[PDB]
Amino acid sequence: NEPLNVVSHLNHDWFLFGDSRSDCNHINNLKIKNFDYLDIHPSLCNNGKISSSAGDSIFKSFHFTRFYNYTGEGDQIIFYEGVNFNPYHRFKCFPNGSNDVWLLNKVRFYRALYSNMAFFRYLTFVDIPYNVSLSKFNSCKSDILSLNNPIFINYSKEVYFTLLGCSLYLVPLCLFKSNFSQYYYNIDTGSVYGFSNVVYPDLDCIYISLKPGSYKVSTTAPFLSLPTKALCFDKSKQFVPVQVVDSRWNNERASDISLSVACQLPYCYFRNSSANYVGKYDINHGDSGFISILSGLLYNVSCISYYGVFLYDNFTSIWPYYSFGRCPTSSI
Amino acid sequence: NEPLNVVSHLNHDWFLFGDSRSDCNHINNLKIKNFDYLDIHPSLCNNGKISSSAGDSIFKSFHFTRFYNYTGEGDQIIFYEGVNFNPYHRFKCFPNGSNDVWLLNKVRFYRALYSNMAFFRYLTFVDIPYNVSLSKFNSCKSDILSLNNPIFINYSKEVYFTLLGCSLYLVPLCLFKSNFSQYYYNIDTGSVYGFSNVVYPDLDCIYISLKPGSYKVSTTAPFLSLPTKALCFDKSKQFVPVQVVDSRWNNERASDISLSVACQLPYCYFRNSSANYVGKYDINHGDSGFISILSGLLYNVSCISYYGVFLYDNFTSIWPYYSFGRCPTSSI
Ligand SMILES: *[C@@H]1O[C@H](CO)[C@@H](O[C@@H]2O[C@H](CO)[C@@H](O[C@@H]3O[C@H](CO[C@H]4O[C@H](CO)[C@@H](O)[C@H](O)[C@@H]4O)[C@@H](O)[C@H](O[C@H]4O[C@H](CO)[C@@H](O)[C@H](O)[C@@H]4O)[C@@H]3O)[C@H](O)[C@H]2NC(C)=O)[C@H](O)[C@H]1NC(C)=O
Ligand SMILES: *[C@@H]1O[C@H](CO)[C@@H](O[C@@H]2O[C@H](CO)[C@@H](O[C@@H]3O[C@H](CO[C@H]4O[C@H](CO)[C@@H](O)[C@H](O)[C@@H]4O)[C@@H](O)[C@H](O[C@H]4O[C@H](CO)[C@@H](O)[C@H](O)[C@@H]4O)[C@@H]3O)[C@H](O)[C@H]2NC(C)=O)[C@H](O)[C@H]1NC(C)=O
Ligand SMILES: *[C@@H]1O[C@H](CO)[C@@H](O[C@@H]2O[C@H](CO)[C@@H](O[C@@H]3O[C@H](CO)[C@@H](O)[C@H](O[C@H]4O[C@H](CO)[C@@H](O)[C@H](O)[C@@H]4O)[C@@H]3O)[C@H](O)[C@H]2NC(C)=O)[C@H](O)[C@H]1NC(C)=O
Ligand SMILES: *[C@@H]1O[C@H](CO)[C@@H](O[C@@H]2O[C@H](CO)[C@@H](O[C@@H]3O[C@H](CO)[C@@H](O)[C@H](O[C@H]4O[C@H](CO)[C@@H](O)[C@H](O)[C@@H]4O)[C@@H]3O)[C@H](O)[C@H]2NC(C)=O)[C@H](O)[C@H]1NC(C)=O
Ligand SMILES: *[C@@H]1O[C@H](CO)[C@@H](O[C@@H]2O[C@H](CO)[C@@H](O[C@@H]3O[C@H](CO)[C@@H](O)[C@H](O)[C@@H]3O)[C@H](O)[C@H]2NC(C)=O)[C@H](O)[C@H]1NC(C)=O
Ligand SMILES: *[C@@H]1O[C@H](CO)[C@@H](O[C@@H]2O[C@H](CO)[C@@H](O[C@@H]3O[C@H](CO)[C@@H](O)[C@H](O)[C@@H]3O)[C@H](O)[C@H]2NC(C)=O)[C@H](O)[C@H]1NC(C)=O
Ligand SMILES: *[C@@H]1O[C@H](CO)[C@@H](O[C@@H]2O[C@H](CO)[C@@H](O)[C@H](O)[C@H]2NC(C)=O)[C@H](O)[C@H]1NC(C)=O
Ligand SMILES: *[C@@H]1O[C@H](CO)[C@@H](O[C@@H]2O[C@H](CO)[C@@H](O)[C@H](O)[C@H]2NC(C)=O)[C@H](O)[C@H]1NC(C)=O
Ligand SMILES: *[C@@H]1O[C@H](CO)[C@@H](O)[C@H](O)[C@H]1NC(C)=O
Ligand SMILES: *[C@@H]1O[C@H](CO)[C@@H](O)[C@H](O)[C@H]1NC(C)=O
Ligand SMILES: *[C@@H]1O[C@H](CO)[C@@H](O)[C@H](O)[C@H]1NC(C)=O
Ligand SMILES: *[C@@H]1O[C@H](CO)[C@@H](O)[C@H](O)[C@H]1NC(C)=O
Ligand SMILES: *[C@@H]1O[C@H](CO)[C@@H](O)[C@H](O)[C@H]1NC(C)=O
Ligand SMILES: *[C@@H]1O[C@H](CO)[C@@H](O)[C@H](O)[C@H]1NC(C)=O
């Protein structure tokens, strides 16, 4: 037996959050209409256990108008996304700003996402309804991405928004640069969630996990910055960690380390290719090492460890540290 | 092999947070000066790996003048405390109040404590220094317990307190009944921590985990409620869960379920006696089942699971679910 650098599952209940490298609906918008762009084995399209869009991550769909309603449910959860918001995209809001605080926003968003998806099993995006108020206010623009989450409104009063139906949410709380402090005060219970931005040049965010109540917003600022899209975590289950595959570009383009900083123990197992990224369909689709990683979905396993995935459960060479499931031993 | 209902350790680096049932200095204040009151095996006094006081829990030492500076360091952490703040003590602040919100405060405190001690290894109590301001204000009293954490002061301005030296703190943020909102705004970074109390009759608390910065307090209230004691978590290590033994009274006295509600997976393993509590030294010291539980400290083991502790690592009967360490298998 040997630990394997794959992502897998223990039973028939798993789910994958994919992208254009795992999109079975991406063939309807290509020129060469084959299956040579998928990083997964192409017999996995008929499951319904894969949510994937033509060039959408969960962060990009969460903040921006380039939207795909991800929806999934499963015990073991595997992610393959994050290639659609990188230092390659150079996203800012005003030319004196920067994108490193956007990479910190990506780290905080995926940290909150793995930390909540290790405990819940259902995931979808929900909207935040309001009245017909002052609709938007264009404070950020970059000609390649335009965000709607969060809304910017001239303050003048305390707005309200309710949350029901779900079990645990994930809204943003974003500010540019101030001495002020926006709050998401709960009317029913009384729990207060706040954030300020002192020294971060561009639009800094944190990602709180709200409960299904009714919330008001108060900031004492010229612009309250209030969300319009939020996640939805349902059907709280027993603790199952969330697996990652390192979704990055080719080395001629930019990359980051955000999916490894956000993926920490015990709630998360990070799988990375050892070699570089050499595509098959084009430069940026179909690497053989990532086919070797994603090929573990095709079969049940016994154990899931921090160092690898174990197929059989008789014995093994190295000890499974931070193991999960029916796991073999290394004693003679 | 068989899973055991004990608490144990994997190497020479462990620590126990005890009480008067595990206090080797409690013999200097007794009448019958023997070792028949310890729930542990009495050859463990010379380690320095046990912190324990004559009738102090960590919650009681954290809020009240009945104080013991707990100090410990270790990889595997075992608790045996919580018998010193129960529904047997009937603690309130004003006769129209209640102690069930104090049991909710105990649940939230121990949840924050296990969640942080699963990742750090050093634990001690620190003080919060101030100027010579208005010293106290007696808002709560119960003739058996008098708390100093938090201080109550007529507001009149925004106070400041700094935190340095440590790596991660744990301060309270407590209020009685208001429509107002106290905050612990960070001057340096800008992170805001707040809480309000709408419908909870007695002094409700939440326990935030501050970073070592400099914090100001603003509430817009007649009384800001500001801490004077805080925990200190140092030397961040790799994830090791924190073990609990169910520290309760005898059944003729009151009990609770707080140490089982606060101890949830994956960060915590809860060990409980199956039978009742029949003491040996008196009614409330030295049960044979808790001697059987605490006797696992005397020897190294291989695995630590949610269902039991495994000594050898050849094979076992049932599968170790949520295991930890060098763990055996159950495949034939
Ligand atoms: C998953 O695993 C892969 C490995 O397969 C990791 O890829 C490595 O990523 C790091 C950074 O992300 C790379 O380090 C950088 O190397 C540059 C030079 O690389 C040349 O040499 C290598 C062989 O050594 C060639 O393969 C490669 O094609 C290049 O020809 C340096 O110039 C970089 O330094 C610059 O950036 C840093 C960033 O902080 C600055 O501090 C420096 O001052 C400088 O400006 C950098 O050191 C590494 O080369 C990659 N390896 C390979 C084999 O490609 C992934 O990072 C990993 N995934 C995660 C999430 O960690
Ligand atoms: C660790 O494991 C021990 C078991 O060894 C648990 O102890 C049990 O604790 C629960 C509650 O904490 C007890 O349930 C209560 O039982 C009362 C009657 O008990 C009699 O009968 C048992 C045998 O069945 C005798 O052993 C016992 O001495 C008594 O003679 C009920 O009257 C209680 O109901 C009342 O309180 C509840 C509280 O919500 C109300 O809702 C009810 O309406 C009612 O007012 C209650 O059901 C149980 O008896 C204990 N077992 C034993 C063997 O003593 C520990 O709780 C566990 N530790 C943790 C943290 O869970
Ligand atoms: C992203 O996708 C998710 C899931 O795909 C989605 O959440 C779902 O939204 C739908 C509607 O958008 C919800 O469906 C409603 O559920 C309630 C409660 O069960 C029903 O009463 C509703 O029925 C009424 O409306 C029907 C027509 O829609 C009528 O036929 C009927 O007679 C009723 O009048 C309705 O079915 C659903 O509850 C949620 N949640 C789940 C878990 O499915 C989410 O809204 C999407 N978000 C975005 C931004 O696209
Ligand atoms: C609970 O207990 C903990 C640990 O027992 C305790 O934390 C420690 O407090 C002491 C002092 O109370 C700290 O010791 C100081 O550390 C600094 C930095 O190393 C030294 O520079 C200091 O030395 C000065 O003072 C000495 C006399 O105390 C002089 O001899 C010397 O020349 C210097 O002038 C001093 O040793 C210590 O750093 C902390 N932390 C740790 C990890 O030990 C905590 O204060 C206690 N809390 C309560 C409420 O009792
Ligand atoms: C991994 O383990 C799971 C364990 O559930 C396997 O799922 C189960 O696979 C068997 C294969 O024979 C399914 O039985 C078949 O069911 C269909 C109807 O669903 C029936 O028409 C067939 O004749 C056969 O009886 C079983 O239903 C299925 N369990 C489910 C879906 O809950 C899974 O196949 C294993 N392998 C992989 C690669 O996932
Ligand atoms: C559980 O495992 C740990 C693994 O570290 C054991 O600790 C080690 O025990 C040996 C026992 O021989 C110690 O060796 C002795 O060291 C002393 C000096 O410390 C020396 O005087 C003796 O002659 C002997 O060589 C070893 O130091 C110790 N490791 C430490 C302290 O880091 C432990 O004994 C095992 N058992 C239990 C019940 O904990
Ligand atoms: C290890 O577990 C496998 C599970 O089937 C046992 O069966 C062996 O499986 C391998 C690969 O699937 C085959 O190459 C062997 O021929 C199988 N052996 C037999 C006897 O059928 C295997 O016996 C187990 N090894 C042990 C318990 O030592
Ligand atoms: C299981 O592990 C033990 C670890 O020592 C092996 O040794 C046995 O230990 C038990 C209890 O300590 C003794 O009763 C046996 O006599 C020991 N056996 C031998 C051969 O010394 C034991 O061999 C292992 N069992 C396996 C691998 O099946
Ligand atoms: C912002 O960018 C503009 C672009 O020319 C520059 O003139 C200006 O100095 C920068 N800084 C501020 C504070 O406006
Ligand atoms: C705006 O929404 C609030 C939500 O509580 C509601 O009370 C109010 O009537 C709405 N106003 C309009 C004009 O729809
Ligand atoms: C915010 O505070 C800083 C320092 O206190 C000050 O320099 C700056 O002018 C303030 N900005 C506003 C809009 O008050
Ligand atoms: C509080 O307790 C006192 C004790 O007698 C009682 O008179 C009073 O009605 C109670 N309630 C309030 C709101 O003061
Ligand atoms: C009170 O403490 C603050 C801390 O910043 C300090 O600035 C101030 O001088 C102190 N006042 C007195 C009277 O000690
Ligand atoms: C707090 O709010 C409630 C309901 O809004 C009200 O009944 C109560 O009088 C308020 N208390 C104070 C001190 O304003």
Q: What is the distance of C-alpha A43 from the center of its chain?
A: 25
Q: How far apart are CA B144 and CA B147, in angstroms?
A: 10
Largest Cα span, chain A: 72
| Ligand 2 atom closest to the CA of B274, numbered from 1 | 5
Question: Which is nearest to B307 in space by CA: B270, B256, B255?
Answer: B270
In the reported structure, the alpha carbon of residue A137 is separated from the centroid of ligand 9 by a whole-number distance in angstroms of 21
State yes or no: is A9 an active-site residue: no
- One-letter amino acid for residue A224 of the chain: L
Is there an atom of ligand 6 within 6 Å of B69 CB? no
Give B297 Cα–ligand 6 centroid separation in angstroms. 15
Give the nearest chain A residue to B204 (CA atoms). Answer: A190
B282 catalytically annotated: yes
| Residue B99 host element (H or E) | none
**Hey, which residues does B245 pair with through a beta bridge?**
B271
User: How many Cα atoms sit within 13 Å of B258 on the Cβ side?
Assistant: 28
Q: Cα A89–A90–A93 angle (5° rounding)?
A: 120
Q: How far apart are CA B312 and CA B246, in angstroms?
A: 25
Out of A239, A314, A331, closest to residue B265 by CB:
A239
Per the CB < 8 A criterion, the answer to whether A164 and A83 are in contact is: no
**Cα gap B118→B76, rounded to integer Å:** 9
Phi-psi region of B286 (alpha: psi -120 to 50; beta: other; left: phi over 0): left
Distance CA A22, CA A42 (A): 9
| E strand or H helix that includes residue A292 | helix A288-294
Of all ligands present, the nearest one to the C-alpha of A47 is 5
Token pair listed for A168: 């645990």
User: Taking CB atoms and an 8 Å limit, are B185 and A181 in contact across chains?
Assistant: yes
Provide φ and ψ at A162, rounded to 5°.
-105, 160
Which of residues 227 through 246 in chain A touch B, CB cutoff 8 A? 238-239
CA distance readout (Å), B92 to A190, B103, B144, B145, B253: 21, 11, 10, 9, 18
Tokens of A56: 């959408």
Distance of CA B209 to the CA centre of its chain: 14
Q: Which two tokens stand for residue A10?
A: 């223990």
Say if CB B303 and CB B309 are below 8 A apart. Answer: yes
Q: How far is the CA of B316 from the centre of ligand 8 (A)?
A: 13
Alpha carbon dihedral A248, A250, A254, A257, in 10-degree steps, equals: 30
Q: Which residues in chain A have their CB less than 8 angstroms from residue B323's CB?
A: 323, 327
Compute φ and ψ for A59, nearest 5 degrees: -70, -45
Tell me whether residues B198 and A191 touch, CB distance under 8 A: no
Q: Whose CA is closest to atom 6 on ligand 12?
A: B96
- Alpha carbons A168 and A233: distance in angstroms, whole number: 5
Query: What backbone phi and psi angles, to 5 degrees, belong to B261?
Result: -75, -40
Interface test with B, best of A10, A158, A183, A196 (most B CBs within 10 A): A196
CA distance A193 to B192: 8
Which residue is listed with tokens 């379920």? B257
- Given CB atoms, is A257 within the 8 Å cutoff of chain B? no
DSSP B9: B
Q: Where are the beta strands (DSSP E) in chain A?
A: 14-17, 50-51, 71-73, 76-79, 122-127, 151-154, 159-162, 168-175, 182-183, 191-195, 204-208, 214-217, 223-226, 229-234, 242-245, 268-271, 303-304, 309-310
Q: Buried b vs exposed e over B144-157: b needs ≥16 C-beta within 10 Å? A: ebebebbbbbebee
List of chain B residues whose C-beta atoms are within 8 Å of the C-beta of residue A305: none
Tell me how far apart the alpha carbons of residues A51 and B321 are, in angstroms, rounded to a whole number: 30
How many angstroms separate the CA atoms of B61 and B56, rounded? 6
Size of interface A-B (CB pairs under 8 A): 83
Neighbours of B257 (CB within 10 A): 11
Both tokens assigned to B273: 């006696």
Strand stretches in A117-195, DSSP E: 122-127, 151-154, 159-162, 168-175, 182-183, 191-195
Sequence letter at residue B102: W
Residues 6 or more apart in contact with residue B144 via CB below 8 angstroms: B89, B90, B91
